[PDB]
């Protein structure tokens, strides 16, 4: 009944109780609603890094019968971790990075000098003056882990993405957009426009650096310190001697996690590689973890979204869980995969009381139906899947006769893959 949460801890609280049938539940969080879809039944109640806000009264009831449950999540150590915010130097042409966390974290800079995006030297100095082209990255290392940040730069001196580039920002967190332009001659200028209208006065920032044989490389930054639903629009950046590259910018007052959602049912055969992937587009950094009967495996993030797959199946069927709890929103997605090994009947139970139950196992296509053929049979199994955890292995029992045959013993499995029988 009483839960004690120490710091940003990652533990599971989505226990399963035997409830199969026409049962549907709905999560009732601390003075707020929570949409869920269980498998009957167990619903999304596990947590990865329980934030100082994420604690309190959490209820859950069934709606068809109506019985409600109650859990009290309680929490001192002053642990804080927040993504770094970019900033422009005070009366100087340089960019300094700052991070709001306890204690002051070590911030380093990265710039992939090679043609593509472990490599390239990190200059941990915070105030960065040398910043032209490449993938600009800024990460922090505090006592509560590691919170990364990425400075977006759209290089005009490259082929277009052609996939509608976008960048969602948090209401209040500053908005930054730079243009890594490369022109042989010095006569080249970049301009910022929202919808064919000039950029705000408090946004213009020029930093033209000269590189290689008589060649210049200019960068036009777009700075907006306080962002709001006023600057939610597609921003373009055209140049004097370079094509017009553009990127849409949307705002969210809290956050957003969106995912396509799959059929959640697979008839995978032996080997054949097979993978369970999720198409999720989300802001901010999606903290993901896959769960499978106590397993903990973290996941990695053409360009319209960032998908991630879980190829650690290794012929282990069952219900695979995929949680993704961001720093504001929560999401969970379970999928069911069964093995195509259809099956040898051998797990017979020698019951002496009236008739011995002979059961055949494995999964999903399994049928138990027993020299010559004998008429009149007992049970025929028939039961719904996902009905609480308990004992290992599941079989389809189909033997309960009263005829006096003597030594014979039933159990003869028949399926699409083949046949087998017990003693």
């Amino acid at each position: 009944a009483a839960v004690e949460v120490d710091v940003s801890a990652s533990i599971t609280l989505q226990v399963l109780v035997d409830a199969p049938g026409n049962i549907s539940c709905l999560w009732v969080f601390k003075h707020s609603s929570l949409n869920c879809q269980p498998h009957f039944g167990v619903v999304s109640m596990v947590i990865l890094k329980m934030t100082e806000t994420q604690a309190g009264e959490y209820l859950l009831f069934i709606q068809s019968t109506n019985y409600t449950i109650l859990f009290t999540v309680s929490i001192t150590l002053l642990y804080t971790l927040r993504r770094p915010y970019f900033r422009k130097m005070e009366n100087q042409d340089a960019l300094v990075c700052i991070s709001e966390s306890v204690p002051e974290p070590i911030v380093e800079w990265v710039l992939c000098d090679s043609q593509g995006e472990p490599a390239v030297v990190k200059k941990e100095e915070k105030v960065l003056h040398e910043l032209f082209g490449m993938d600009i990255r800024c990460c922090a290392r505090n006592e509560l882990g590691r919170e990364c940040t990425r400075l977006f730069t759209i290089d005009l001196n490259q082929t277009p993405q052609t996939t509608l580039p976008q960048l969602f920002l948090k209401v209040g967190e500053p908005l930054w957009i730079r243009c890594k332009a490369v022109h042989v001659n010095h006569g080249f200028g970049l301009t910022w426009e929202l919808e064919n209208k000039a950029l705000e006065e408090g946004n213009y920032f020029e930093m033209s650096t000269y590189s290689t044989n008589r060649t210049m490389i200019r960068i036009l930054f777009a700075f907006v310190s306080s962002v709001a639903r006023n600057d939610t629009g597609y921003y373009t950046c055209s140049s004097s001697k370079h094509p017009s590259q553009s990127a849409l910018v949307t705002i969210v007052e809290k956050g957003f996690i969106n995912a396509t959602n799959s059929s959640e049912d697979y008839e995978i055969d032996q080997y054949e590689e097979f993978c369970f992937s999720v198409r999720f587009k989300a802001y901010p950094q999606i903290r993901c973890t896959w769960t499978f009967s106590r397993k903990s495996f973290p996941c990695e993030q053409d360009n319209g979204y960032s998908i991630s797959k879980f190829c650690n199946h290794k012929h282990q069927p069952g219900e695979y869980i995929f949680h993704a709890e961001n720093d504001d929103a929560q999401f969970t997605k379970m999928f069911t995969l069964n093995i195509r090994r259809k099956p040898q009947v051998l797990a017979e139970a020698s019951a002496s009381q009236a008739s011995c139950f002979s059961d055949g196992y494995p999964l999903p296509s399994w049928t138990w139906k027993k020299c010559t053929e004998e008429i009149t049979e007992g049970v025929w199994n028939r039961k719904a899947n996902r009905k609480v955890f308990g004992q290992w292995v599941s079989s389809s029992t189909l033997n309960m006769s009263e005829a006096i045959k003597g030594f014979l013993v039933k159990c003869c499995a028949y399926n699409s893959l083949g046949t087998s029988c017990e003693t």
Binding site: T209, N213, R218
Partner: protein, 134 residues
């Protein structure tokens, strides 16, 4: 003879680092003649001082050894833009004093700081002829 108003800024933001790097790696303090009587104007005179400095930078490329050629040319490329305007030959009235390459480099950087915010705003066609004022 062009309007001399530059389309986009010819003065880069990293000129100070480039000048300090040449100042710290110079093995010898080469003899250089800065001007002592150019007509009194910081903006108008800035271009004139850079034209004289650019000639010295080109001259230094022809006398510095193999190892120093790259560093000298790096400075030359930052101030080569003055060669795009039809600046006329220095008048016979022009006077100058002998100094060292370190001082010339520092003076050059100072002129670029002063000229940078005005190079694309005003028409400097009337500056093609260097003027004196004793």
């Amino acid at each position: 003879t062009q309007d001399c108003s530059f389309q986009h800024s010819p003065i880069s933001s990293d000129f100070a680092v480039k000048i300090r790097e040449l100042s710290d790696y110079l093995d010898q303090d080469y003899p250089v003649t800065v001007a002592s009587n150019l007509q009194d104007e910081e903006l108008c005179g800035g271009l004139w001082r850079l034209v004289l400095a650019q000639r010295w930078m080109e001259r230094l490329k022809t006398v510095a050894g193999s190892k120093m050629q790259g560093l000298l040319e790096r400075v030359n490329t930052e101030i080569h833009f003055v060669t795009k305007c039809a600046f006329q030959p220095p008048p016979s009235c022009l006077r100058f004093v002998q100094t060292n390459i370190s001082r010339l480099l520092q003076e050059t950087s100072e002129q670029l700081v002063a000229l940078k915010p005005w190079i694309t705003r005003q028409n400097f066609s009337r500056c093609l002829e260097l003027q004196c004022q004793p």
